Amino acid sequence: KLLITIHDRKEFAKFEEERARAKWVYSPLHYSAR
Amino acid sequence: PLGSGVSFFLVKEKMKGKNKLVPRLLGITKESVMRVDEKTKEVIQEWSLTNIKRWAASPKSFTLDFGDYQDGYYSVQTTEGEQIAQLIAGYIDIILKKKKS
């Protein structure tokens, strides 16, 4: 049996790192004036 | 009832307990968003298009934020994040033109 300790670490790290450094966008349904 | 003209996107979600991603199907329409299981081919949970407050689009991962409906947070890994963000924005523009106050 072979164990993986390189593809799982790089995929999870890139997911959570880009998750906190993402730009937020608001919808015009809640806000009336802009 | 089953509607005609549905857009499906390939997205991955992480399971509770273990730190690993698994394949999942996501069906988006002009009225509501729903998640379909790849193994059973059935709907588990769905959300309304007008209940969404804000969303974040990244190169490899899409994020969603609900107001007074969901308790936790919905996060998935998408290959075409720019195409999904443009599709949701266009559906909101069509509703505002039909039902204007």
mmCIF file of N, CA and C in Angstrom:
data_model
loop_
_atom_site.group_PDB
_atom_site.id
_atom_site.type_symbol
_atom_site.label_atom_id
_atom_site.label_comp_id
_atom_site.label_asym_id
_atom_site.label_seq_id
_atom_site.Cartn_x
_atom_site.Cartn_y
_atom_site.Cartn_z
ATOM 1 N N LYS A 1 0.847 -1.239 0.000
ATOM 2 C CA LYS A 1 0.000 0.000 0.000
ATOM 3 C C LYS A 1 0.869 1.271 0.000
ATOM 4 N N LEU A 2 0.439 2.294 -0.767
ATOM 5 C CA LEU A 2 1.164 3.575 -0.868
ATOM 6 C C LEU A 2 0.373 4.702 -0.180
ATOM 7 N N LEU A 3 1.083 5.563 0.580
ATOM 8 C CA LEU A 3 0.464 6.694 1.296
ATOM 9 C C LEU A 3 0.755 8.020 0.575
ATOM 10 N N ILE A 4 -0.265 8.901 0.498
ATOM 11 C CA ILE A 4 -0.133 10.215 -0.164
ATOM 12 C C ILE A 4 0.072 11.320 0.892
ATOM 13 N N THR A 5 1.147 12.120 0.728
ATOM 14 C CA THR A 5 1.471 13.221 1.661
ATOM 15 C C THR A 5 2.111 14.421 0.913
ATOM 16 N N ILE A 6 1.532 14.778 -0.255
ATOM 17 C CA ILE A 6 2.030 15.903 -1.075
ATOM 18 C C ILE A 6 0.892 16.563 -1.900
ATOM 19 N N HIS A 7 0.022 15.743 -2.536
ATOM 20 C CA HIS A 7 -1.107 16.258 -3.345
ATOM 21 C C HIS A 7 -2.249 16.778 -2.450
ATOM 22 N N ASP A 8 -2.513 16.078 -1.324
ATOM 23 C CA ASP A 8 -3.577 16.470 -0.373
ATOM 24 C C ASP A 8 -3.206 17.759 0.397
ATOM 25 N N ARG A 9 -1.903 17.929 0.713
ATOM 26 C CA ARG A 9 -1.407 19.116 1.445
ATOM 27 C C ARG A 9 -1.427 20.383 0.563
ATOM 28 N N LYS A 10 -1.030 20.245 -0.722
ATOM 29 C CA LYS A 10 -0.997 21.380 -1.672
ATOM 30 C C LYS A 10 -2.412 21.817 -2.111
ATOM 31 N N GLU A 11 -3.345 20.850 -2.255
ATOM 32 C CA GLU A 11 -4.732 21.142 -2.679
ATOM 33 C C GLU A 11 -5.544 21.831 -1.559
ATOM 34 N N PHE A 12 -5.409 21.344 -0.304
ATOM 35 C CA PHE A 12 -6.133 21.928 0.848
ATOM 36 C C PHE A 12 -5.564 23.312 1.231
ATOM 37 N N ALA A 13 -4.224 23.476 1.135
ATOM 38 C CA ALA A 13 -3.557 24.756 1.458
ATOM 39 C C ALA A 13 -3.960 25.867 0.469
ATOM 40 N N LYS A 14 -4.012 25.529 -0.839
ATOM 41 C CA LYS A 14 -4.403 26.485 -1.900
ATOM 42 C C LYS A 14 -5.895 26.879 -1.792
ATOM 43 N N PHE A 15 -6.741 25.946 -1.303
ATOM 44 C CA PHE A 15 -8.189 26.187 -1.137
ATOM 45 C C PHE A 15 -8.461 27.213 -0.013
ATOM 46 N N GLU A 16 -7.921 26.946 1.194
ATOM 47 C CA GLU A 16 -8.112 27.819 2.375
ATOM 48 C C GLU A 16 -7.352 29.162 2.262
ATOM 49 N N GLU A 17 -6.159 29.167 1.615
ATOM 50 C CA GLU A 17 -5.362 30.408 1.444
ATOM 51 C C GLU A 17 -6.094 31.409 0.527
ATOM 52 N N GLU A 18 -6.623 30.914 -0.614
ATOM 53 C CA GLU A 18 -7.378 31.754 -1.570
ATOM 54 C C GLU A 18 -8.783 32.115 -1.024
ATOM 55 N N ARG A 19 -9.304 31.294 -0.078
ATOM 56 C CA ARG A 19 -10.631 31.509 0.543
ATOM 57 C C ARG A 19 -10.681 32.823 1.359
ATOM 58 N N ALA A 20 -9.617 33.095 2.141
ATOM 59 C CA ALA A 20 -9.533 34.311 2.977
ATOM 60 C C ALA A 20 -9.069 35.554 2.184
ATOM 61 N N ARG A 21 -8.386 35.348 1.033
ATOM 62 C CA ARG A 21 -7.887 36.462 0.195
ATOM 63 C C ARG A 21 -8.759 36.667 -1.069
ATOM 64 N N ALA A 22 -10.095 36.530 -0.919
ATOM 65 C CA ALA A 22 -11.045 36.713 -2.033
ATOM 66 C C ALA A 22 -11.808 38.042 -1.894
ATOM 67 N N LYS A 23 -12.189 38.644 -3.040
ATOM 68 C CA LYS A 23 -12.930 39.921 -3.056
ATOM 69 C C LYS A 23 -14.443 39.672 -2.917
ATOM 70 N N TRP A 24 -15.108 40.454 -2.040
ATOM 71 C CA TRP A 24 -16.560 40.324 -1.800
ATOM 72 C C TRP A 24 -17.366 41.265 -2.708
ATOM 73 N N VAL A 25 -18.543 40.786 -3.157
ATOM 74 C CA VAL A 25 -19.448 41.555 -4.029
ATOM 75 C C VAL A 25 -20.862 41.578 -3.417
ATOM 76 N N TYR A 26 -21.478 42.776 -3.358
ATOM 77 C CA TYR A 26 -22.829 42.949 -2.789
ATOM 78 C C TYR A 26 -23.890 43.045 -3.897
ATOM 79 N N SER A 27 -25.106 42.534 -3.613
ATOM 80 C CA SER A 27 -26.221 42.548 -4.579
ATOM 81 C C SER A 27 -27.077 43.826 -4.440
ATOM 82 N N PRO A 28 -27.773 44.271 -5.536
ATOM 83 C CA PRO A 28 -28.621 45.482 -5.508
ATOM 84 C C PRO A 28 -30.049 45.257 -4.940
ATOM 85 N N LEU A 29 -30.379 44.011 -4.522
ATOM 86 C CA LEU A 29 -31.711 43.690 -3.963
ATOM 87 C C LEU A 29 -31.876 44.233 -2.527
ATOM 88 N N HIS A 30 -30.801 44.150 -1.712
ATOM 89 C CA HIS A 30 -30.826 44.632 -0.313
ATOM 90 C C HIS A 30 -30.626 46.158 -0.234
ATOM 91 N N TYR A 31 -29.637 46.690 -0.986
ATOM 92 C CA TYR A 31 -29.341 48.139 -0.997
ATOM 93 C C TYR A 31 -30.210 48.873 -2.031
ATOM 94 N N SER A 32 -30.730 50.059 -1.650
ATOM 95 C CA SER A 32 -31.579 50.879 -2.536
ATOM 96 C C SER A 32 -30.769 52.006 -3.202
ATOM 97 N N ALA A 33 -30.009 52.774 -2.390
ATOM 98 C CA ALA A 33 -29.182 53.886 -2.891
ATOM 99 C C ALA A 33 -27.700 53.487 -2.970
ATOM 100 N N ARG A 34 -27.005 53.951 -4.030
ATOM 101 C CA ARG A 34 -25.575 53.653 -4.239
ATOM 102 C C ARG A 34 -24.793 54.917 -4.625
ATOM 103 N N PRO B 1 -42.007 19.409 -10.489
ATOM 104 C CA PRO B 1 -41.914 19.528 -11.960
ATOM 105 C C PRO B 1 -40.472 19.796 -12.419
ATOM 106 N N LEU B 2 -40.105 19.246 -13.594
ATOM 107 C CA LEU B 2 -38.757 19.419 -14.166
ATOM 108 C C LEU B 2 -38.765 20.521 -15.241
ATOM 109 N N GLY B 3 -37.928 21.560 -15.045
ATOM 110 C CA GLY B 3 -37.843 22.673 -15.993
ATOM 111 C C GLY B 3 -36.858 22.415 -17.130
ATOM 112 N N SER B 4 -37.044 23.125 -18.263
ATOM 113 C CA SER B 4 -36.171 22.985 -19.442
ATOM 114 C C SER B 4 -35.123 24.110 -19.488
ATOM 115 N N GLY B 5 -33.861 23.746 -19.800
ATOM 116 C CA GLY B 5 -32.772 24.722 -19.877
ATOM 117 C C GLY B 5 -32.094 24.955 -18.532
ATOM 118 N N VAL B 6 -31.334 23.948 -18.056
ATOM 119 C CA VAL B 6 -30.617 24.026 -16.767
ATOM 120 C C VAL B 6 -29.094 23.966 -16.999
ATOM 121 N N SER B 7 -28.341 24.832 -16.290
ATOM 122 C CA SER B 7 -26.872 24.884 -16.400
ATOM 123 C C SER B 7 -26.221 24.177 -15.201
ATOM 124 N N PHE B 8 -25.412 23.132 -15.480
ATOM 125 C CA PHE B 8 -24.726 22.356 -14.430
ATOM 126 C C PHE B 8 -23.213 22.630 -14.442
ATOM 127 N N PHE B 9 -22.622 22.774 -13.240
ATOM 128 C CA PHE B 9 -21.178 23.035 -13.080
ATOM 129 C C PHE B 9 -20.534 21.979 -12.168
ATOM 130 N N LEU B 10 -19.272 21.611 -12.469
ATOM 131 C CA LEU B 10 -18.528 20.614 -11.675
ATOM 132 C C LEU B 10 -17.790 21.301 -10.511
ATOM 133 N N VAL B 11 -18.191 20.973 -9.266
ATOM 134 C CA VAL B 11 -17.587 21.561 -8.052
ATOM 135 C C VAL B 11 -17.263 20.478 -7.004
ATOM 136 N N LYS B 12 -16.238 20.738 -6.166
ATOM 137 C CA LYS B 12 -15.815 19.798 -5.109
ATOM 138 C C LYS B 12 -16.064 20.393 -3.714
ATOM 139 N N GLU B 13 -16.505 19.542 -2.765
ATOM 140 C CA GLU B 13 -16.789 19.965 -1.380
ATOM 141 C C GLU B 13 -16.078 19.042 -0.371
ATOM 142 N N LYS B 14 -15.646 19.612 0.773
ATOM 143 C CA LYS B 14 -14.952 18.843 1.827
ATOM 144 C C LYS B 14 -15.952 18.248 2.837
ATOM 145 N N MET B 15 -15.716 16.984 3.242
ATOM 146 C CA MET B 15 -16.585 16.279 4.207
ATOM 147 C C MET B 15 -16.113 16.526 5.654
ATOM 148 N N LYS B 16 -17.046 16.406 6.623
ATOM 149 C CA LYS B 16 -16.734 16.613 8.054
ATOM 150 C C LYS B 16 -15.913 15.438 8.619
ATOM 151 N N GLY B 17 -14.930 15.754 9.488
ATOM 152 C CA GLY B 17 -14.073 14.733 10.094
ATOM 153 C C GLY B 17 -12.715 14.633 9.407
ATOM 154 N N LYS B 18 -12.717 14.218 8.124
ATOM 155 C CA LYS B 18 -11.480 14.079 7.329
ATOM 156 C C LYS B 18 -11.235 15.337 6.477
ATOM 157 N N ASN B 19 -9.958 15.587 6.122
ATOM 158 C CA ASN B 19 -9.574 16.757 5.301
ATOM 159 C C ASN B 19 -9.298 16.337 3.840
ATOM 160 N N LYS B 20 -10.377 15.976 3.115
ATOM 161 C CA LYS B 20 -10.285 15.548 1.708
ATOM 162 C C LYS B 20 -11.499 16.052 0.901
ATOM 163 N N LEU B 21 -11.276 16.365 -0.392
ATOM 164 C CA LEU B 21 -12.339 16.858 -1.290
ATOM 165 C C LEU B 21 -12.947 15.707 -2.115
ATOM 166 N N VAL B 22 -14.262 15.804 -2.406
ATOM 167 C CA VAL B 22 -14.986 14.780 -3.192
ATOM 168 C C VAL B 22 -15.825 15.432 -4.320
ATOM 169 N N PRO B 23 -15.998 14.754 -5.508
ATOM 170 C CA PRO B 23 -16.782 15.307 -6.643
ATOM 171 C C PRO B 23 -18.275 15.511 -6.310
ATOM 172 N N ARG B 24 -18.844 16.648 -6.766
ATOM 173 C CA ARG B 24 -20.262 16.983 -6.527
ATOM 174 C C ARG B 24 -20.852 17.775 -7.713
ATOM 175 N N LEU B 25 -22.158 17.570 -7.990
ATOM 176 C CA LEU B 25 -22.858 18.267 -9.089
ATOM 177 C C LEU B 25 -23.707 19.427 -8.541
ATOM 178 N N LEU B 26 -23.646 20.596 -9.214
ATOM 179 C CA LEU B 26 -24.407 21.789 -8.802
ATOM 180 C C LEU B 26 -25.275 22.319 -9.959
ATOM 181 N N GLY B 27 -26.610 22.313 -9.761
ATOM 182 C CA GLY B 27 -27.550 22.801 -10.773
ATOM 183 C C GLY B 27 -28.063 24.200 -10.448
ATOM 184 N N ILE B 28 -27.819 25.168 -11.355
ATOM 185 C CA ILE B 28 -28.249 26.568 -11.160
ATOM 186 C C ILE B 28 -29.312 26.959 -12.206
ATOM 187 N N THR B 29 -30.404 27.603 -11.742
ATOM 188 C CA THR B 29 -31.499 28.057 -12.622
ATOM 189 C C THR B 29 -31.764 29.560 -12.405
ATOM 190 N N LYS B 30 -32.680 30.141 -13.207
ATOM 191 C CA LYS B 30 -33.019 31.580 -13.113
ATOM 192 C C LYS B 30 -33.887 31.936 -11.875
ATOM 193 N N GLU B 31 -34.418 30.923 -11.149
ATOM 194 C CA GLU B 31 -35.273 31.163 -9.967
ATOM 195 C C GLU B 31 -34.611 30.723 -8.644
ATOM 196 N N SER B 32 -33.925 29.554 -8.629
ATOM 197 C CA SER B 32 -33.290 29.041 -7.393
ATOM 198 C C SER B 32 -32.042 28.180 -7.673
ATOM 199 N N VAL B 33 -31.202 28.012 -6.628
ATOM 200 C CA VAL B 33 -29.967 27.203 -6.702
ATOM 201 C C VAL B 33 -30.173 25.891 -5.915
ATOM 202 N N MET B 34 -29.660 24.763 -6.451
ATOM 203 C CA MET B 34 -29.805 23.445 -5.798
ATOM 204 C C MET B 34 -28.568 22.554 -6.015
ATOM 205 N N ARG B 35 -28.315 21.647 -5.050
ATOM 206 C CA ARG B 35 -27.174 20.713 -5.104
ATOM 207 C C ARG B 35 -27.661 19.279 -5.386
ATOM 208 N N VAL B 36 -27.046 18.619 -6.390
ATOM 209 C CA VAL B 36 -27.402 17.238 -6.779
ATOM 210 C C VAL B 36 -26.243 16.273 -6.456
ATOM 211 N N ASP B 37 -26.582 15.077 -5.930
ATOM 212 C CA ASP B 37 -25.578 14.051 -5.580
ATOM 213 C C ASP B 37 -25.152 13.255 -6.832
ATOM 214 N N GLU B 38 -23.830 13.098 -7.027
ATOM 215 C CA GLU B 38 -23.269 12.368 -8.189
ATOM 216 C C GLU B 38 -23.605 10.855 -8.182
ATOM 217 N N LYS B 39 -23.735 10.243 -6.984
ATOM 218 C CA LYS B 39 -24.015 8.793 -6.862
ATOM 219 C C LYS B 39 -25.517 8.452 -6.962
ATOM 220 N N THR B 40 -26.369 9.137 -6.170
ATOM 221 C CA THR B 40 -27.829 8.868 -6.162
ATOM 222 C C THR B 40 -28.606 9.666 -7.233
ATOM 223 N N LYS B 41 -28.017 10.774 -7.754
ATOM 224 C CA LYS B 41 -28.660 11.633 -8.782
ATOM 225 C C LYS B 41 -29.981 12.261 -8.264
ATOM 226 N N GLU B 42 -29.954 12.760 -7.009
ATOM 227 C CA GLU B 42 -31.126 13.390 -6.370
ATOM 228 C C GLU B 42 -30.734 14.699 -5.664
ATOM 229 N N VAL B 43 -31.735 15.566 -5.402
ATOM 230 C CA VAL B 43 -31.509 16.860 -4.725
ATOM 231 C C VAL B 43 -31.531 16.676 -3.193
ATOM 232 N N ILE B 44 -30.525 17.251 -2.499
ATOM 233 C CA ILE B 44 -30.420 17.163 -1.028
ATOM 234 C C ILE B 44 -30.999 18.435 -0.373
ATOM 235 N N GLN B 45 -30.448 19.612 -0.738
ATOM 236 C CA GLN B 45 -30.903 20.909 -0.196
ATOM 237 C C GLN B 45 -30.838 22.003 -1.279
ATOM 238 N N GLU B 46 -31.739 23.005 -1.182
ATOM 239 C CA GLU B 46 -31.794 24.112 -2.157
ATOM 240 C C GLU B 46 -32.007 25.477 -1.474
ATOM 241 N N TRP B 47 -31.583 26.554 -2.165
ATOM 242 C CA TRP B 47 -31.707 27.939 -1.669
ATOM 243 C C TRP B 47 -32.345 28.836 -2.740
ATOM 244 N N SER B 48 -33.036 29.911 -2.309
ATOM 245 C CA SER B 48 -33.678 30.852 -3.246
ATOM 246 C C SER B 48 -32.660 31.881 -3.773
ATOM 247 N N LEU B 49 -32.884 32.370 -5.009
ATOM 248 C CA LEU B 49 -31.989 33.360 -5.648
ATOM 249 C C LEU B 49 -32.061 34.750 -4.971
ATOM 250 N N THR B 50 -33.264 35.150 -4.504
ATOM 251 C CA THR B 50 -33.468 36.464 -3.850
ATOM 252 C C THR B 50 -33.007 36.493 -2.370
ATOM 253 N N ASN B 51 -32.729 35.316 -1.757
ATOM 254 C CA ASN B 51 -32.282 35.249 -0.345
ATOM 255 C C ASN B 51 -30.752 35.478 -0.194
ATOM 256 N N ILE B 52 -29.987 35.420 -1.312
ATOM 257 C CA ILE B 52 -28.521 35.627 -1.280
ATOM 258 C C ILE B 52 -28.193 37.109 -0.993
ATOM 259 N N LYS B 53 -27.227 37.346 -0.079
ATOM 260 C CA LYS B 53 -26.811 38.711 0.305
ATOM 261 C C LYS B 53 -25.514 39.129 -0.414
ATOM 262 N N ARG B 54 -24.459 38.292 -0.318
ATOM 263 C CA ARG B 54 -23.155 38.583 -0.954
ATOM 264 C C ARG B 54 -22.390 37.290 -1.302
ATOM 265 N N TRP B 55 -21.427 37.398 -2.241
ATOM 266 C CA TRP B 55 -20.608 36.249 -2.678
ATOM 267 C C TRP B 55 -19.192 36.694 -3.091
ATOM 268 N N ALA B 56 -18.209 35.786 -2.936
ATOM 269 C CA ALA B 56 -16.809 36.056 -3.304
ATOM 270 C C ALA B 56 -16.343 35.055 -4.368
ATOM 271 N N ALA B 57 -15.749 35.567 -5.464
ATOM 272 C CA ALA B 57 -15.268 34.723 -6.567
ATOM 273 C C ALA B 57 -13.736 34.723 -6.650
ATOM 274 N N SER B 58 -13.126 33.537 -6.451
ATOM 275 C CA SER B 58 -11.666 33.369 -6.518
ATOM 276 C C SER B 58 -11.298 32.530 -7.758
ATOM 277 N N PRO B 59 -10.007 32.553 -8.220
ATOM 278 C CA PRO B 59 -9.569 31.791 -9.416
ATOM 279 C C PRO B 59 -9.873 30.277 -9.361
ATOM 280 N N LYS B 60 -9.793 29.665 -8.157
ATOM 281 C CA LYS B 60 -10.036 28.216 -7.991
ATOM 282 C C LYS B 60 -11.190 27.870 -7.016
ATOM 283 N N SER B 61 -11.673 28.830 -6.188
ATOM 284 C CA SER B 61 -12.753 28.532 -5.216
ATOM 285 C C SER B 61 -13.824 29.634 -5.136
ATOM 286 N N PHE B 62 -15.107 29.208 -5.126
ATOM 287 C CA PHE B 62 -16.263 30.118 -5.015
ATOM 288 C C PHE B 62 -16.814 30.094 -3.574
ATOM 289 N N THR B 63 -17.242 31.268 -3.066
ATOM 290 C CA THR B 63 -17.797 31.391 -1.703
ATOM 291 C C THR B 63 -19.198 32.033 -1.743
ATOM 292 N N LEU B 64 -20.105 31.552 -0.867
ATOM 293 C CA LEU B 64 -21.488 32.063 -0.786
ATOM 294 C C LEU B 64 -21.842 32.456 0.661
ATOM 295 N N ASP B 65 -22.633 33.538 0.818
ATOM 296 C CA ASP B 65 -23.056 34.033 2.140
ATOM 297 C C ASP B 65 -24.578 34.275 2.161
ATOM 298 N N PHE B 66 -25.294 33.546 3.041
ATOM 299 C CA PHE B 66 -26.759 33.671 3.171
ATOM 300 C C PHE B 66 -27.133 34.546 4.379
ATOM 301 N N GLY B 67 -28.288 35.238 4.288
ATOM 302 C CA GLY B 67 -28.752 36.110 5.370
ATOM 303 C C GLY B 67 -29.416 35.344 6.509
ATOM 304 N N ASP B 68 -30.762 35.385 6.567
ATOM 305 C CA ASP B 68 -31.535 34.689 7.616
ATOM 306 C C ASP B 68 -32.137 33.380 7.066
ATOM 307 N N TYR B 69 -31.261 32.389 6.803
ATOM 308 C CA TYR B 69 -31.683 31.076 6.271
ATOM 309 C C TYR B 69 -30.706 29.961 6.698
ATOM 310 N N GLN B 70 -29.401 30.140 6.390
ATOM 311 C CA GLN B 70 -28.356 29.158 6.738
ATOM 312 C C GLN B 70 -27.564 29.617 7.977
ATOM 313 N N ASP B 71 -27.095 28.644 8.786
ATOM 314 C CA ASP B 71 -26.317 28.931 10.007
ATOM 315 C C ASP B 71 -24.803 28.962 9.711
ATOM 316 N N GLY B 72 -24.295 27.922 9.013
ATOM 317 C CA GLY B 72 -22.872 27.842 8.672
ATOM 318 C C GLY B 72 -22.516 28.604 7.398
ATOM 319 N N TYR B 73 -21.473 28.135 6.682
ATOM 320 C CA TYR B 73 -21.011 28.769 5.431
ATOM 321 C C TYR B 73 -20.850 27.725 4.314
ATOM 322 N N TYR B 74 -21.158 28.127 3.063
ATOM 323 C CA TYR B 74 -21.051 27.237 1.892
ATOM 324 C C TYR B 74 -19.799 27.585 1.061
ATOM 325 N N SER B 75 -18.839 26.637 0.997
ATOM 326 C CA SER B 75 -17.584 26.819 0.244
ATOM 327 C C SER B 75 -17.289 25.596 -0.644
ATOM 328 N N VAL B 76 -16.954 25.840 -1.929
ATOM 329 C CA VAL B 76 -16.645 24.756 -2.890
ATOM 330 C C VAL B 76 -15.551 25.181 -3.892
ATOM 331 N N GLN B 77 -14.823 24.186 -4.443
ATOM 332 C CA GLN B 77 -13.750 24.432 -5.425
ATOM 333 C C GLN B 77 -14.311 24.342 -6.858
ATOM 334 N N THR B 78 -14.356 25.495 -7.561
ATOM 335 C CA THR B 78 -14.877 25.569 -8.941
ATOM 336 C C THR B 78 -13.760 25.825 -9.968
ATOM 337 N N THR B 79 -13.898 25.219 -11.163
ATOM 338 C CA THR B 79 -12.930 25.397 -12.261
ATOM 339 C C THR B 79 -13.264 26.656 -13.092
ATOM 340 N N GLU B 80 -14.571 27.016 -13.164
ATOM 341 C CA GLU B 80 -15.038 28.195 -13.918
ATOM 342 C C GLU B 80 -15.782 29.176 -12.982
ATOM 343 N N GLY B 81 -15.020 29.814 -12.067
ATOM 344 C CA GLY B 81 -15.589 30.772 -11.109
ATOM 345 C C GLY B 81 -16.105 32.064 -11.746
ATOM 346 N N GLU B 82 -15.443 32.528 -12.828
ATOM 347 C CA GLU B 82 -15.849 33.764 -13.536
ATOM 348 C C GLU B 82 -17.189 33.581 -14.283
ATOM 349 N N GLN B 83 -17.435 32.363 -14.817
ATOM 350 C CA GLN B 83 -18.682 32.052 -15.551
ATOM 351 C C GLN B 83 -19.895 31.967 -14.602
ATOM 352 N N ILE B 84 -19.700 31.394 -13.390
ATOM 353 C CA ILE B 84 -20.790 31.267 -12.391
ATOM 354 C C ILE B 84 -21.192 32.655 -11.833
ATOM 355 N N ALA B 85 -20.192 33.520 -11.551
ATOM 356 C CA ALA B 85 -20.442 34.881 -11.018
ATOM 357 C C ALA B 85 -21.246 35.751 -12.008
ATOM 358 N N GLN B 86 -20.916 35.653 -13.316
ATOM 359 C CA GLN B 86 -21.613 36.419 -14.374
ATOM 360 C C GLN B 86 -23.062 35.914 -14.584
ATOM 361 N N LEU B 87 -23.287 34.592 -14.402
ATOM 362 C CA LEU B 87 -24.622 33.976 -14.569
ATOM 363 C C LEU B 87 -25.614 34.440 -13.477
ATOM 364 N N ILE B 88 -25.142 34.519 -12.211
ATOM 365 C CA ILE B 88 -25.985 34.956 -11.072
ATOM 366 C C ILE B 88 -26.355 36.452 -11.204
ATOM 367 N N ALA B 89 -25.371 37.296 -11.592
ATOM 368 C CA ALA B 89 -25.590 38.749 -11.773
ATOM 369 C C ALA B 89 -26.656 39.043 -12.847
ATOM 370 N N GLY B 90 -26.607 38.296 -13.974
ATOM 371 C CA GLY B 90 -27.570 38.474 -15.065
ATOM 372 C C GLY B 90 -29.005 38.098 -14.688
ATOM 373 N N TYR B 91 -29.179 37.025 -13.879
ATOM 374 C CA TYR B 91 -30.522 36.578 -13.437
ATOM 375 C C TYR B 91 -31.198 37.631 -12.536
ATOM 376 N N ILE B 92 -30.402 38.321 -11.688
ATOM 377 C CA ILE B 92 -30.925 39.377 -10.792
ATOM 378 C C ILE B 92 -31.389 40.605 -11.617
ATOM 379 N N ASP B 93 -30.649 40.924 -12.707
ATOM 380 C CA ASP B 93 -30.979 42.061 -13.595
ATOM 381 C C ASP B 93 -32.342 41.866 -14.306
ATOM 382 N N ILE B 94 -32.662 40.609 -14.695
ATOM 383 C CA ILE B 94 -33.937 40.284 -15.381
ATOM 384 C C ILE B 94 -35.148 40.430 -14.421
ATOM 385 N N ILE B 95 -34.972 40.039 -13.138
ATOM 386 C CA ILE B 95 -36.050 40.127 -12.122
ATOM 387 C C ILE B 95 -36.379 41.601 -11.780
ATOM 388 N N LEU B 96 -35.339 42.458 -11.667
ATOM 389 C CA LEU B 96 -35.522 43.894 -11.345
ATOM 390 C C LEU B 96 -36.304 44.643 -12.448
ATOM 391 N N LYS B 97 -36.107 44.243 -13.724
ATOM 392 C CA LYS B 97 -36.795 44.875 -14.870
ATOM 393 C C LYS B 97 -38.286 44.471 -14.946
ATOM 394 N N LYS B 98 -38.619 43.230 -14.520
ATOM 395 C CA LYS B 98 -40.011 42.731 -14.545
ATOM 396 C C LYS B 98 -40.814 43.238 -13.331
ATOM 397 N N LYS B 99 -40.237 43.099 -12.116
ATOM 398 C CA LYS B 99 -40.888 43.540 -10.869
ATOM 399 C C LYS B 99 -40.164 44.769 -10.290
ATOM 400 N N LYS B 100 -40.523 45.964 -10.801
ATOM 401 C CA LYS B 100 -39.923 47.235 -10.356
ATOM 402 C C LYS B 100 -40.868 47.973 -9.388
ATOM 403 N N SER B 101 -40.300 48.527 -8.297
ATOM 404 C CA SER B 101 -41.075 49.266 -7.284
ATOM 405 C C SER B 101 -40.842 50.776 -7.409
#
